[PDB]
Design a protein around this ligand. Structure first.
Ligand code: ATP
Ligand code: ATP
Ligand code: NA
Ligand code: NA
Lengths: 220, 50, 552
RNA sequence: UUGAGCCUUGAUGUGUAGGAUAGGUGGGAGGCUUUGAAGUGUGGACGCCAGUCUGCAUGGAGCCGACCUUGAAAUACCACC
């Protein structure tokens, strides 16, 4: 219905300017929702080779505007450090099977460079959704003071898909377009720094910007 | 004539090789002997090559 | 434009004798192309496959694949570990992920340890955080639980020694495939598979792209999948676009024309020889140029290397009424029952074809008949006039370090078949092993030549209860028909185990059909009469395929 | 009249068991539904044959998310697809 009608508005053939895209997208403010941002970066890279996949984590400056519980698993008194800093959930090394036995709705990874008790089933119990943490992302360390603020900041990982197509939350429409552009630049520079060991052609083949219910526009 | 020329490449990695004639029909197994390698000045094992 | 996965340019090949099994084969391949390689036993198909996969670089010419393509090469007789089990043999295939999980759990152990926490991790784990992602080492468990279904692999606890012939090829196929490759080069991929597995594999092959070069002697298998046919007759590469039925007529036409040209050249040589042998007629020329032309005309051409003809089978002792009856036979391995309460009696002078799925006890029956095994119940009662001669299911019983003649005869200038002796050289020559081809070591032999030689060596006992276990292993059309016509004349009894019902359609007089639960049923007649029996007492059931697939 | 390429529009993706044809990440969330339902004939391609996509018949205001009993989840834009 309305999507077919606004297919006239969309101009998917023409790539669009960094700020002209946001100018087009903000006219879609008539949606009955928060209208979050759903950027899709489309790199040029072959995913089959292991060395040509990147999985990092960068801290977006202006934030996401949507928060989830942060769960920290500590072997000992590590699971209580966030209890005095605002951590959503603390798991004990003796409560590895009871860390999320009832509910698993805790999208916060586990960082504990000293307590390595609980990991979880080795078999997608804590490895399918990414519950297994490592210092490559940035959370692998025994200093939880930085991670306490990083969880509230929302350090977004670079989920490399089957062909190098990544999404994130980029400061939904209620954030000003200048903040949005700052986030775009800060993510583009970060991924350019993240470029793998082998690269050819142009790294960033395309970028699209859209809303959970709002159509897509090129970024160029 | 059924014997064809073969060369015994070295095994020390240097470029040095002897040459000989080997019956490739009745001796499909490859040759390897101990010969002198005047580059490294040692008796190393010489394996069969092209 | 674009495309062009693989190329070969003037790729010659010389063997120790002197001939060129391959000479001047220049051709290229394209993405999503299916090529079927034909020829005779000795044409060079397997050598071409080895060259194309890149095993051997002793060629003259060039053979290039495009970079970044994965090549899966299935050889003639894949070699596995007689110590391994199915679990630890398949687990080898996905190797970068088993070690990935092991090392990731070890790093989960070592990362909380405060010793070099920022040195032992950033350099080592980072090389694995993507080896566990691109290859997806997390979900190999469900990947295997799914991929086992399609092939219907043997049980995980099964050992390679306990494994049967068809299941071994099934395991090897899974191992080869799991790499998810682009180029798929197979040499006779359906040697031991039954109707279900062969139909499944030839549907999966047709679906799967990335170019498949398949060696096959089976018209029906080739027709479904092949888009191109390579001939590979006598050191030449003939590409044909079409199907088997259209290409066979062109092949026959080519042979007829070559024979006609041969006859014409012969007649020309006679005519010029007469002039060469004539007189001089005075003080005149006699034409040194004409002499040079005639001398040049004396060239040589290769007769088709093995247009093998009817084989040799020496009958032996006279046989009477008792043909080794069987009463109340029951077999099992632990709890796995193969056959229960089987009773029959083979008549005299008959051929009995055995049909059934893979690993259903067909080889076990010959094993217990030849005295290798024992029956858990009942008894097999041999006839006292019966001479036994059973062909092993596997070629891997010769010694590769011996010559053909030595291997067959035993280093005797005169051996004996049955009762009369006759020379060993003649005995081998009756199997189309000429004096020149006598000298090749049995390790240097094609699949069909190895099968022929093993059959020749074993059939010299001069028995009369021939227990053939898939003699149609690696046999061409003409090689197959030679034995197919020789068997119909056998005086003694012949029990034949095979999977290709078209071979049995011409020779079988009694039928042993295997079924579920360990049910073996006897029947008297050929396959058309078996179909008549089914239609007289029919049952509506045709829903065989389901196409399990491999990836989610 | 056509081969081939490119770009956009559509459609197709049925292992086992949760519910029953489900390709990957989503971004996260009930909104779609009313340019007129879940429902009532069947249009037709296909199917692994249970049916899910779809022309036209009156009215025209309906399904799931979430819970997950399985590795994974909810066709509810757009992305190189
Ligand atoms: N050392 C050797 N001396 C003589 N002939 C040899 C030697 N090595 C190989 N050959 C011959 O080279 C040929 C190789 O053929 P190849 O292995 O490709 O099998 P094929 O008969 O073409 O195919 P297939 O067995 O798969 O049906 C055979 O004729 C073999 O006898
Ligand atoms: N020693 C053994 N221990 C355990 N199982 C065995 C043993 N020998 C045979 N089997 C099993 O018995 C079954 C029948 O094996 P058999 O050798 O008769 O195969 P087959 O029916 O002739 O098959 P194929 O199509 O491979 O020729 C298989 O399931 C096999 O695993
Ligand atoms: Na071969
Ligand atoms: Na067998």
């Amino acid at each position: 219905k309305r999507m077919r009608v606004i297919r006239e508005k969309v101009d998917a053939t023409k790539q669009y300017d960094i700020n002209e895209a946001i100018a087009l997208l903000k006219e879609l403010a008539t949606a009955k929702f928060v209208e979050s941002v759903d950027v899709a970066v489309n790199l040029g890279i072959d995913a089959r080779k292991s060395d040509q996949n990147v999985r990092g984590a960068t801290v977006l400056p202006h934030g996401t505007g949507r928060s989830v519980r942060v769960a920290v698993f500590t072997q000992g008194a590590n699971a209580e450090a966030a209890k005095a800093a605002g951590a959503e959930l603390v798991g004990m090394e003796d409560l590895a099977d009871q860390i999320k036995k009832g509910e698993m709705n805790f999208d916060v990874v586990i960082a504990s460079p000293d307590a390595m008790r609980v990991v979880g089933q080795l078999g997608q119990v804590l490895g399918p959704r990414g519950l297994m943490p490592n210092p490559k992302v940035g959370t692998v360390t025994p200093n939880v003071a930085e991670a306490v603020k990083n969880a509230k900041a929302g350090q977004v990982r670079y989920r490399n898909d089957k062909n190098g197509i990544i999404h994130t939350t980029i400061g939904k429409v209620d954030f000003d377009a200048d903040k949005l552009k700052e986030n775009l630049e800060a993510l583009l520079v970060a991924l350019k720094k993240a470029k793998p060991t082998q690269a050819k052609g142009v790294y960033i083949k395309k970028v699209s910007i859209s809303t959970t219910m709002g159509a897509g526009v090129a970024v160029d | 004539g059924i014997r064809e020329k073969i060369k015994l490449v070295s095994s020390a990695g240097t470029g040095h090789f002897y040459t000989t004639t080997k019956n490739k029909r009745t001796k499909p197994e490859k040759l390897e002997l101990k010969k002198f390698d005047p580059v490294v000045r040692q008796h190393v094992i010489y394996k069969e090559a092209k | 434009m674009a495309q062009f996965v693989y190329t070969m340019h003037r790729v010659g090949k010389v063997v120790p004798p002197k001939r060129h099994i391959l000479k001047n084969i220049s051709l290229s391949f394209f993405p999503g192309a299916k090529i079927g390689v034909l020829g005779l036993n000795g044409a060079g198909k397997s050598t071409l496959l080895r060259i194309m996969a890149g095993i051997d670089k002793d060629i003259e010419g060039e053979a290039r694949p495009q970079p970044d393509i994965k090549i899966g090469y299935l050889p003639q007789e894949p070699q596995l570990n007689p110590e391994h089990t199915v679990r630890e043999s398949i687990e080898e295939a996905v190797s970068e992920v088993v070690n990935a999980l092991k090392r990731l759990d070890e790093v989960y152990a070592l990362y909380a340890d405060p010793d070099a926490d920022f040195d032992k991790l950033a350099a080592e784990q980072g090389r694995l955080e993507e080896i566990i992602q691109a290859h997806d080492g997390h979900n190999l468990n469900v990947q295997l639980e799914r991929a086992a279904d399609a092939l219907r692999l043997p049980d995980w606890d099964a050992k390679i020694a306990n494994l049967s012939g068809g299941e071994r090829r099934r395991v090897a196929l899974c191992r080869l495939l799991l790499e998810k490759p682009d180029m798929l080069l197979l040499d006779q991929p359906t040697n031991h598979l039954d109707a279900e597995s062969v139909a499944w594999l030839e549907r999966f092959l047709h679906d799967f792209e990335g170019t498949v070069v398949a060696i096959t002697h089976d018209r029906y298998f080739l027709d479904n999948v092949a888009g191109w046919i390579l001939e590979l007759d006598r050191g030449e590469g003939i590409p044909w676009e079409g199907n088997y039925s259209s290409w066979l007529e062109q092949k026959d036409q080519r042979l007829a024309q070559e024979a006609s040209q041969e006859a014409a050249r012969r007649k020309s040589i006679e005519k010029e020889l007469e002039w060469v042998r004539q007189g001089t007629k005075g003080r005149q020329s006699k034409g040194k140029a004409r002499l040079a032309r005639f001398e040049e005309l004396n060239s040589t051409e290769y007769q088709k290397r093995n247009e093998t003809n009817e084989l040799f089978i020496p009958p032996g002792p006279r046989l009477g009424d008792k043909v080794l009856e069987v009463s109340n036979l029951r077999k099992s391995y632990g709890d796995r029952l193969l056959i229960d309460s089987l009773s029959f009696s083979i008549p005299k002078g008959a051929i009995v074809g055995i049909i059934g799925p893979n690993g259903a006890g067909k080889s076990t029956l010959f094993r217990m008949i030849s005295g290798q095994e024992q029956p858990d119940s009942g008894t097999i009662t041999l006839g006292e006039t019966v001479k036994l001669a059973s062909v092993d299911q596997f070629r891997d019983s010769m010694d590769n370090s011996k010559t053909v003649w030595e291997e067959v005869s035993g280093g005797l200038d005169i051996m004996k078949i049955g009762n009369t002796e006759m020379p060993s050289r003649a005995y081998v020559g009756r199997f189309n092993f000429k004096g020149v081809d006598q000298g090749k070591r049995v390790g240097e032999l094609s699949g069909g030549e190895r099968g022929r030689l093993h059959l020749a060596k074993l059939l010299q006992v001069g028995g009369n209860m021939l227990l053939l276990d898939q003699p149609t292993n690696d046999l061409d059309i003409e090689t197959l028909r030679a034995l197919e016509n020789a068997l119909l004349e056998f005086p003694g009894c012949a029990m034949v185990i095979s999977h290709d019902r078209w071979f049995l359609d011409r020779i079988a007089t009694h039928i042993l059909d295997y079924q579920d639960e360990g049910k073996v049923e006897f029947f008297e007649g050929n396959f058309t009469e078996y179909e008549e029996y089914k239609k007289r007492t029919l049952g509506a059931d045709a829903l065989e395929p389901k196409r399990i697939k491999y990836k989610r």
